[PDB]
Design an enzyme around this catalytic site. Structure first.
Site, PDB file in Angstrom:
ATOM      1  N   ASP A 151     -10.965   4.882  11.615  1.00  0.00           N
ATOM      2  CA  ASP A 151     -11.244   3.639  12.335  1.00  0.00           C
ATOM      3  C   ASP A 151     -12.753   3.359  12.425  1.00  0.00           C
ATOM      4  OD1 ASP A 151     -10.910   2.389  15.734  1.00  0.00           O
ATOM      5  OD2 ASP A 151     -10.730   1.294  13.901  1.00  0.00           O
ATOM      6  N   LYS A 168      -6.610   0.587 -10.357  1.00  0.00           N
ATOM      7  CA  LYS A 168      -7.237   0.551 -11.683  1.00  0.00           C
ATOM      8  C   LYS A 168      -6.302   1.116 -12.753  1.00  0.00           C
ATOM      9  CE  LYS A 168     -11.334   2.819 -13.922  1.00  0.00           C
ATOM     10  NZ  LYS A 168     -10.599   2.398 -15.150  1.00  0.00           N
ATOM     11  N   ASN A 351       6.350   3.299   0.991  1.00  0.00           N
ATOM     12  CA  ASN A 351       5.516   2.904  -0.151  1.00  0.00           C
ATOM     13  C   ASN A 351       5.755   1.453  -0.457  1.00  0.00           C
ATOM     14  OD1 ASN A 351       8.186   3.551  -1.213  1.00  0.00           O
ATOM     15  ND2 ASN A 351       7.277   3.011  -3.191  1.00  0.00           N
ATOM     16  N   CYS A 353       7.819  -0.102  -2.281  1.00  0.00           N
ATOM     17  CA  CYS A 353       9.185  -0.559  -2.431  1.00  0.00           C
ATOM     18  C   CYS A 353      10.149   0.119  -1.489  1.00  0.00           C
ATOM     19  CB  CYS A 353       9.629  -0.394  -3.883  1.00  0.00           C
ATOM     20  SG  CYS A 353       8.707  -1.457  -5.024  1.00  0.00           S
ATOM     21  N   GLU A 355      11.063   3.236  -0.871  1.00  0.00           N
ATOM     22  CA  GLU A 355      11.968   4.327  -1.267  1.00  0.00           C
ATOM     23  C   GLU A 355      11.329   5.698  -1.093  1.00  0.00           C
ATOM     24  OE1 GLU A 355      10.349   3.341  -5.502  1.00  0.00           O
ATOM     25  OE2 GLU A 355      10.110   2.736  -3.397  1.00  0.00           O
ATOM     26  N   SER A 535      12.153  -3.408 -13.587  1.00  0.00           N
ATOM     27  CA  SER A 535      11.820  -3.601 -15.000  1.00  0.00           C
ATOM     28  C   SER A 535      12.697  -2.739 -15.894  1.00  0.00           C
ATOM     29  CB  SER A 535      10.350  -3.248 -15.266  1.00  0.00           C
ATOM     30  OG  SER A 535       9.465  -4.165 -14.633  1.00  0.00           O
TER      31      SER A 535
HETATM   32  N1  DGT Z   1     -10.547  -7.156 -13.159  1.00  0.00           N
HETATM   33  C1  DGT Z   1     -10.657  -5.836 -13.369  1.00  0.00           C
HETATM   34  N2  DGT Z   1     -11.881  -5.257 -13.686  1.00  0.00           N
HETATM   35  C2  DGT Z   1     -11.970  -3.912 -13.890  1.00  0.00           C
HETATM   36  C3  DGT Z   1     -10.841  -3.107 -13.792  1.00  0.00           C
HETATM   37  N3  DGT Z   1     -11.189  -1.814 -14.039  1.00  0.00           N
HETATM   38  C4  DGT Z   1     -12.515  -1.806 -14.313  1.00  0.00           C
HETATM   39  N4  DGT Z   1     -13.007  -3.085 -14.229  1.00  0.00           N
HETATM   40  C5  DGT Z   1     -14.412  -3.502 -14.478  1.00  0.00           C
HETATM   41  C6  DGT Z   1     -15.420  -2.993 -13.452  1.00  0.00           C
HETATM   42  C7  DGT Z   1     -16.647  -2.704 -14.289  1.00  0.00           C
HETATM   43  O1  DGT Z   1     -17.413  -3.904 -14.401  1.00  0.00           O
HETATM   44  C8  DGT Z   1     -16.089  -2.387 -15.668  1.00  0.00           C
HETATM   45  C9  DGT Z   1     -15.955  -0.891 -16.021  1.00  0.00           C
HETATM   46  O2  DGT Z   1     -15.140  -0.268 -15.054  1.00  0.00           O
HETATM   47  P1  DGT Z   1     -14.990   1.329 -15.036  1.00  0.00           P
HETATM   48  O3  DGT Z   1     -16.278   1.983 -15.393  1.00  0.00           O
HETATM   49  O4  DGT Z   1     -14.425   1.721 -13.680  1.00  0.00           O
HETATM   50  O5  DGT Z   1     -13.978   1.503 -16.282  1.00  0.00           O
HETATM   51  P2  DGT Z   1     -13.813   2.826 -17.196  1.00  0.00           P
HETATM   52  O6  DGT Z   1     -14.801   3.916 -16.944  1.00  0.00           O
HETATM   53  O7  DGT Z   1     -12.368   3.246 -17.085  1.00  0.00           O
HETATM   54  O8  DGT Z   1     -14.041   2.286 -18.692  1.00  0.00           O
HETATM   55  P3  DGT Z   1     -15.450   2.139 -19.447  1.00  0.00           P
HETATM   56  O9  DGT Z   1     -15.859   3.407 -20.136  1.00  0.00           O
HETATM   57  O10 DGT Z   1     -16.516   1.858 -18.401  1.00  0.00           O
HETATM   58  O11 DGT Z   1     -15.352   0.991 -20.412  1.00  0.00           O
HETATM   59  O12 DGT Z   1     -14.827  -3.004 -15.741  1.00  0.00           O
HETATM   60  C10 DGT Z   1      -9.620  -3.690 -13.454  1.00  0.00           C
HETATM   61  O13 DGT Z   1      -8.614  -2.973 -13.329  1.00  0.00           O
HETATM   62  N5  DGT Z   1      -9.533  -5.056 -13.244  1.00  0.00           N
HETATM   63  N1  DGT Z   2     -15.512  -7.753  12.396  1.00  0.00           N
HETATM   64  C1  DGT Z   2     -16.259  -6.644  12.496  1.00  0.00           C
HETATM   65  N2  DGT Z   2     -15.678  -5.403  12.731  1.00  0.00           N
HETATM   66  C2  DGT Z   2     -16.458  -4.288  12.824  1.00  0.00           C
HETATM   67  C3  DGT Z   2     -17.838  -4.380  12.693  1.00  0.00           C
HETATM   68  N3  DGT Z   2     -18.385  -3.139  12.825  1.00  0.00           N
HETATM   69  C4  DGT Z   2     -17.364  -2.280  13.060  1.00  0.00           C
HETATM   70  N4  DGT Z   2     -16.177  -2.970  13.066  1.00  0.00           N
HETATM   71  C5  DGT Z   2     -14.829  -2.393  13.307  1.00  0.00           C
HETATM   72  C6  DGT Z   2     -14.333  -1.449  12.216  1.00  0.00           C
HETATM   73  C7  DGT Z   2     -13.583  -0.389  12.992  1.00  0.00           C
HETATM   74  O1  DGT Z   2     -12.238  -0.830  13.178  1.00  0.00           O
HETATM   75  C8  DGT Z   2     -14.255  -0.382  14.356  1.00  0.00           C
HETATM   76  C9  DGT Z   2     -15.307   0.722  14.591  1.00  0.00           C
HETATM   77  O2  DGT Z   2     -16.305   0.617  13.601  1.00  0.00           O
HETATM   78  P1  DGT Z   2     -17.422   1.759  13.459  1.00  0.00           P
HETATM   79  O3  DGT Z   2     -16.839   3.101  13.726  1.00  0.00           O
HETATM   80  O4  DGT Z   2     -18.069   1.600  12.093  1.00  0.00           O
HETATM   81  O5  DGT Z   2     -18.355   1.359  14.716  1.00  0.00           O
HETATM   82  P2  DGT Z   2     -19.338   2.356  15.525  1.00  0.00           P
HETATM   83  O6  DGT Z   2     -19.244   3.799  15.158  1.00  0.00           O
HETATM   84  O7  DGT Z   2     -20.723   1.766  15.421  1.00  0.00           O
HETATM   85  O8  DGT Z   2     -18.864   2.199  17.052  1.00  0.00           O
HETATM   86  P3  DGT Z   2     -17.696   3.029  17.776  1.00  0.00           P
HETATM   87  O9  DGT Z   2     -18.192   4.323  18.349  1.00  0.00           O
HETATM   88  O10 DGT Z   2     -16.661   3.395  16.727  1.00  0.00           O
HETATM   89  O11 DGT Z   2     -17.080   2.155  18.833  1.00  0.00           O
HETATM   90  O12 DGT Z   2     -14.853  -1.646  14.514  1.00  0.00           O
HETATM   91  C10 DGT Z   2     -18.414  -5.623  12.438  1.00  0.00           C
HETATM   92  O13 DGT Z   2     -19.643  -5.709  12.285  1.00  0.00           O
HETATM   93  N5  DGT Z   2     -17.620  -6.754  12.341  1.00  0.00           N
HETATM   94  N1  ADP Z   3       3.958  -4.997  -9.453  1.00  0.00           N
HETATM   95  C1  ADP Z   3       3.861  -3.662  -9.279  1.00  0.00           C
HETATM   96  N2  ADP Z   3       2.655  -3.073  -9.406  1.00  0.00           N
HETATM   97  C2  ADP Z   3       2.491  -1.752  -9.250  1.00  0.00           C
HETATM   98  N3  ADP Z   3       3.498  -0.917  -8.951  1.00  0.00           N
HETATM   99  C3  ADP Z   3       4.753  -1.360  -8.805  1.00  0.00           C
HETATM  100  C4  ADP Z   3       5.031  -2.798  -8.959  1.00  0.00           C
HETATM  101  N4  ADP Z   3       6.351  -2.951  -8.749  1.00  0.00           N
HETATM  102  C5  ADP Z   3       6.864  -1.721  -8.474  1.00  0.00           C
HETATM  103  N5  ADP Z   3       5.898  -0.764  -8.518  1.00  0.00           N
HETATM  104  C6  ADP Z   3       6.044   0.689  -8.257  1.00  0.00           C
HETATM  105  O1  ADP Z   3       7.178   1.197  -8.966  1.00  0.00           O
HETATM  106  C7  ADP Z   3       8.090   1.831  -8.056  1.00  0.00           C
HETATM  107  C8  ADP Z   3       9.540   1.600  -8.482  1.00  0.00           C
HETATM  108  O2  ADP Z   3       9.699   0.228  -8.830  1.00  0.00           O
HETATM  109  P1  ADP Z   3      10.686  -0.235 -10.001  1.00  0.00           P
HETATM  110  O3  ADP Z   3      11.040  -1.676  -9.706  1.00  0.00           O
HETATM  111  O4  ADP Z   3      11.803   0.766 -10.096  1.00  0.00           O
HETATM  112  O5  ADP Z   3       9.654  -0.168 -11.260  1.00  0.00           O
HETATM  113  P2  ADP Z   3       9.945  -0.065 -12.860  1.00  0.00           P
HETATM  114  O6  ADP Z   3      11.405  -0.364 -13.039  1.00  0.00           O
HETATM  115  O7  ADP Z   3       9.012  -1.108 -13.423  1.00  0.00           O
HETATM  116  O8  ADP Z   3       9.529   1.354 -13.148  1.00  0.00           O
HETATM  117  C9  ADP Z   3       7.783   1.265  -6.680  1.00  0.00           C
HETATM  118  O9  ADP Z   3       8.071   2.235  -5.673  1.00  0.00           O
HETATM  119  C10 ADP Z   3       6.306   0.886  -6.765  1.00  0.00           C
HETATM  120  O10 ADP Z   3       5.433   1.881  -6.187  1.00  0.00           O
HETATM  121 MG    MG Z   4     -17.065   4.811  14.921  1.00  0.00          MG
END
Ligand code: DGT
Ligand code: DGT
Ligand code: ADP
Ligand code: MG
Ligand code: ADP
Ligand code: MG
Lengths: 664, 664
Positions: A151, A168, A351, A353, A355, A535
């Site tokens: 929290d 991802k 979770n 779905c 289950e 699916s």
């Molecule tokens: N919209 C979208 N963007 C993603 C997703 N996963 C990664 N990205 C974007 C964020 C970063 O700009 C860039 C690379 O992401 P990561 O370094 O986490 O990817 P990863 O190391 O698996 O592959 P890489 O070797 O960097 O090409 O792609 C995704 O699932 N959806």
């Molecule tokens: N909308 C909003 N919520 C916040 C902000 N700062 C913290 N919160 C929320 C997130 C958490 O559910 C809760 C506590 O946050 P933190 O533990 O980061 O606050 P902090 O340790 O400074 O104070 P605490 O001892 O926990 O009452 O409040 C904020 O600046 N804006």
């Molecule tokens: N759109 C979705 N994106 C990511 N995970 C999913 C999605 N739909 C279902 N799941 C995951 O698959 C599990 C089983 O779903 P199910 O409908 O049997 O999937 P599938 O038949 O495609 O394997 C769920 O408990 C959930 O965690």
């Molecule tokens: Mg705190």
């Protein structure tokens, strides 16, 4: 109908035949746009295939590509079969063999066994297994249950990162958020005031939209779990509502209620209910049952919350379900009381779905790997023609094969985050499900609500659970029990049905199994979690999981092939009957010239009493370690109707009272 | 007008008089809703006050609470004066003394000096200093410049957490995002495809909304910096647009362009421009000048990007500015070439308000602590009445006091994240600004565009910069130079004006200062960064920073008190003149019976040539270490008008070419 022996044949013409060669192609693949080597097969599986090419190549029967129907094969083509440059590189048989090797590795005999059984459609593995098995970082798990770490802004943002990292690499999340202080609650570090759950939900909502399962694959899918005593609960249950107040909705997320029994008692008693910020009333989510009731009741008398009429929350719950299908309903006390994972601590969510029921903490994110058995594959026309029987010996055998598959998957899996690896290696849960219960009842001439259907259902789930624990006991004899076996109900000889205080049906020898489990352990904390198969039932051409059919006629027009068979056989299948199906939502009740036996066999889910659904769900539940994704279906939905459904389910002792509410 | 000697008097009646007693009250405060002890004064300051009560108590002149005007005091009341249970606990004098002790601690003589000077309105400190100085975790900094940590989900989510943590404790963020791969770019880990900057911007946007500066205080405020070669640049510049395509906008964030000179050359040459994903063309943001041009030109010939017409991007830039006031424009090469922080590496962004130019990396988040001098306080009616002079000796003295204050603030500050602490302790930058340049020009009878105003402006900024470096040199003689002094331009005797290749005006002895800096060092890497003073000029009752007035009549009706004085003195102030002000946006040009001298002195910003603005900005810029928040104001805005403004500014060598474009 014909589209199969057409669209599949065209795939054959456009794809390489030889498995090891499709494998070479996948493995040697280079991303053209960047010139980066992008192998689509792991080194390990590539080498296995090369060292065994003749055998694997020759084991494959491409004729089996015609086991798949039209929409079934189109589902595979669109999203499952690996692609090289937007062109499909794999045939279904190749996908299958890749999966089989991805699970089994150097054990070629186990892989061949799995190839045959899957290609012959005795079972399949969940989507992420089909997508990723035998690829370089095989993320084969479907489910993640995530604990809100703290929290605090630090803990909220660490949890958010975790969800991003999980999202991802495909997989749905159940996230519990009970510990987040509600609106108006004091913030000490800055002398400020919290805006509660919604503005936090909206951050997670945007993350689900952003991180679309690997970069243009599928939007992130998160369910959020909350206990109904949380002070933000009225806005939480409405997160999916269609109407105005946009800054207060989170439409890409799914709300689920983690309901304690006390809430249900207060609702039926027409009593009060108290809303707490978790800061005013700590520990409520870290206990259950009487211990919860004692604590809740004390906090309530100490004036630590805000009291209302329980049935005010209830009516609001019921409203959101009518409109949005959500929130889901999972009973916390049932989950906790009847779980083999109870020695781990208190379970705080299910979770995506509804289950999976597995323990999660800030350092442990529960995971599950799923597969489903095709129940129609075990129908045999008996030793004389005319009569059909059910092969329970074969089902037992297949469920044992599948149990072993899912264990291998645990060990061969690539985990997106460390919390997932830690959880899964410690407790090793698994989730077996089923598909085509409806088909099975049809084929066998058993109406869904019949006493015979009731009995089959019970004995099918008894054999699957028995098989899975037997196989898991076997693995514990070879590899040792899961780390956290000792202290567990199963270690004490307490199995799921025992926790329902019931005797098993007794189609199988449970005492020998119990003696064996108590002596040797089991390799898996949980084995059963029948899932939607939303699916994968489409791929195999069966009705999803354990639900009755929603319609004897879908959309291309497709009529219930078992019903169609019957009509032509009775010399009644004509144009006048096809008309009374395109408009009638696919129902045959009341229809002029149709035998009573067909009307009883081909009832739609909308024509079966939800009391029958709940009963059969409660029947099979005694053999489910975890829970199952029970959709409820209501034609003419009213509060008193909804109310009796929830309360009937609750009093049956169901864990998942409701997945979606489907309506109209 | 009268409202001051009313609303302030009522505050006196409702607040305790004795400072040490308001301090006791603040310190012993308990949050009633939770019963938590919530001290609003740090142990350290509490003990200092208790050990010195008679002195501090007696030093305070409560008559000085009447230095504040109506809206000025209402600004203090609403957001600055500490509150106990929604009731204001502090008087302005108490706020001031708390601030003075929060900065100076055990050095009571320094605190008393600061109390007197601030209560007499010679200067003030930025809002977060006023809010937090002498409270338990005093976060007194206004500015954070954040580096996107890595082009990866892990790095994106770590940066997001960092921004959340910074936003929690007040402060605006400038965040640079040049390293994030653009839309369509390959993702290797999952064989997927990126959706680019927008869906990522939307996550940060939601975070800005969520984390409202400490819990219901102020929405988060982030500017994002991008170089115009990034492939997502067309959607980036439109993030604030009002019209449709909601999933593509991020309306709670501010876009800013980090423009290399090459872009400007291609625009004026009517040449091409190439868009790159940073993955195809690495290192562009980690070099500048000719080195950038060489690299950019090579990547461009190697076919690594997508070529368009430069003036296509230009026209789109100009469109968004007309409509939204954004994006801001800061010239990367000017910033980098003319920065004392150049030995640190390449500077990749400015900040929320385009005045800070400081180096940031994944491990180092630049911070700045700000204060502004009230330029009208140094006007003295000369040793004979009738003539007014400017006390440059006093300004020099006050700027030295303020420099020392801001150094103390560095050391006494509570840092929200470790990256901020590391940066600030290593390089120790500071930001002095000004307020009431407009008032100063008025009081002295100098029209904004006059040659006299031009000269005053130059000599004011020369003395502030000279004073601040002299004080900083003094501190380095006591405490050592900042860690990273050696290798720096200043260490080589190169001061800001030198980097503009200019001689200083010479009102001060720069050679002795240079000899001293080269010998002893300076304690601060940077000292000057004139800021908007959007709140703090309101408190002191002066026109914000260095802009001419926008209107001789605001809203309660308030008329330019210097103009009002003049009208009554000329016997022309009547109802017929007040009418020609309520409708005329507060302008006196063309008006029938008004002396030419008044028309020249009380021109609105909308009536002064932006060429004069740019000129005077370029004049003072030679004495600004960092940059300053130059708003441009255009009545009848057209592309060719906008274009000449940007190009004039650019060719003047400005760092901040434009903050907002204000229009109509
Ligand atoms: N919209 C979208 N963007 C993603 C997703 N996963 C990664 N990205 C974007 C964020 C970063 O700009 C860039 C690379 O992401 P990561 O370094 O986490 O990817 P990863 O190391 O698996 O592959 P890489 O070797 O960097 O090409 O792609 C995704 O699932 N959806
Ligand atoms: N909308 C909003 N919520 C916040 C902000 N700062 C913290 N919160 C929320 C997130 C958490 O559910 C809760 C506590 O946050 P933190 O533990 O980061 O606050 P902090 O340790 O400074 O104070 P605490 O001892 O926990 O009452 O409040 C904020 O600046 N804006
Ligand atoms: N759109 C979705 N994106 C990511 N995970 C999913 C999605 N739909 C279902 N799941 C995951 O698959 C599990 C089983 O779903 P199910 O409908 O049997 O999937 P599938 O038949 O495609 O394997 C769920 O408990 C959930 O965690
Ligand atoms: Mg705190
Ligand atoms: N709404 C805001 N939220 C957070 N920080 C801000 C905001 N407005 C300005 N700042 C910070 O204050 C700095 C100076 O702004 P200024 O208008 O002089 O503030 P003030 O007069 O309130 O101290 C900016 O560089 C920016 O980093
Ligand atoms: Mg990466």
């Amino acid at each position: 109908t014909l589209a199969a022996r057409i669209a599949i044949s065209n795939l054959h013409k456009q794809t390489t035949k030889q498995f090891s060669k499709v494998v070479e192609d996948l493995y040697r693949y280079v991303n053209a746009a960047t010139g980066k080597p992008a192998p689509m097969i792991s080194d390990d599986v590539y080498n296995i295939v090369m060292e065994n090419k003749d055998k694997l190549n020759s084991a494959i029967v491409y004729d089996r590509d015609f086991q798949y129907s039209y929409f079934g094969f189109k589902t595979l083509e669109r999203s499952y079969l690996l692609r090289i440059n937007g062109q499909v590189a794999e045939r279904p048989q190749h996908l299958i063999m890749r999966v089989a090797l991805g699970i089994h590795g150097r054990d070629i005999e186990a892989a061949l066994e799995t190839y045959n059984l899957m290609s012959l459609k005795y079972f399949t593995h969940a989507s992420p297994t089909l997508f990723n098995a035998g690829t370089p970082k095989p993320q084969m798990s479907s489910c993640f249950l995530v604990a809100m770490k703290e929290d605090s802004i630090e803990g909220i943002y660490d949890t958010l990162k975790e969800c991003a990292l999980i999202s991802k690499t495909a997989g749905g999340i159940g996230l519990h958020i009970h510990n987040i202080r509600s609106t108006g609650s004091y913030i000490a570090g800055t002398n400020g005031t919290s805006n509660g759950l919604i503005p936090m939900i909206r951050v997670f909502n945007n993350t689900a939209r952003y991180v679309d399962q690997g970069g243009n694959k599928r939007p992130g899918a998160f369910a959020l779990y909350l206990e109904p005593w949380h002070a933000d609960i009225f806005d939480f249950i409405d997160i999916r509502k269609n109407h105005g107040k946009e800054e207060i909705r989170a439409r890409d997320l799914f709300p689920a209620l983690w309901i304690p029994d006390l809430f249900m008692k207060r609702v039926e008693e027409n009593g009060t209910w108290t809303l707490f910020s978790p800061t005013s009333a700590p520990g409520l989510s870290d206990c259950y049952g009487d211990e919860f009731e004692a604590l809740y009741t004390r906090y309530e008398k100490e004036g630590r919350g805000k009291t209302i009429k329980a049935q005010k929350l209830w009516y609001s719950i019921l409203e959101a379900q009518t409109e949005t299908g959500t929130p889901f309903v999972v009973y916390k006390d049932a989950c906790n009381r009847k779980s083999n994972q109870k020695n781990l601590g208190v379970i705080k969510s299910s979770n995506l779905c509804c289950e999976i029921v597995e323990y999660s903490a800030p350092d442990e994110t529960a995971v599950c790997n799923l597969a489903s058995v095709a129940l129609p594959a075990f129908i045999e026309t008996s030793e004389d023609g005319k009569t059909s029987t059910y092969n329970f010996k074969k089902l037992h055998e297949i469920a044992k094969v599948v149990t072993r598959n899912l264990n291998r998957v645990i060990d061969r899996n690539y985990y997106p985050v460390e919390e997932a690896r830690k959880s899964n290696m410690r407790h090793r849960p698994i989730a077996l499900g089923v598909q085509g219960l409806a088909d099975t009842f049809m084929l066998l001439r058993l109406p869904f609500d019949s006493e015979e259907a009731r009995l089959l259902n019970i004995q099918i789930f008894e054999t699957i659970y028995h098989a899975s624990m037997e196989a898991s006991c076997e693995l514990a004899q070879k590899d040792g029990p899961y780390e956290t076996f000792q202290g567990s109900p199963a270690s004490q000889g307490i199995l799921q049905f025992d926790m329902w205080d019931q005797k098993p049906y007794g189609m199988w020898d449970w005492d020998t199994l119990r003696k064996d489990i108590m002596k040797h352990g089991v390799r898996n904390s949980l084995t059963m979690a029948p899932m939607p198969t939303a699916s994968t039932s489409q791929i195999l051409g069966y009705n999803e999981c354990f639900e009755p059919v929603t319609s004897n006629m879908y959309s291309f027009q497709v009529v219930n092939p078992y019903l169609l068979r019957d009509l032509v056989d009775l010399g009644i299948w004509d144009e006048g009957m096809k008309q009374y199906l395109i408009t009638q939502n696919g129902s045959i009740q009341g229809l002029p010239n149709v035998p009573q036996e067909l009307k009883d066999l081909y009832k739609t889910v909308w024509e079966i009493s939800q009391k029958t659904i709940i009963n059969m769900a409660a029947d099979r539940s005694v053999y489910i370690d975890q829970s199952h994704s029970l959709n409820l279906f209501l034609r003419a939905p009213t509060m008193g109707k909804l109310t009796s459904m929830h309360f009937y389910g609750w009093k049956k002792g169901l864990k998942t009272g409701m997945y979606y509410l489907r309506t109209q």
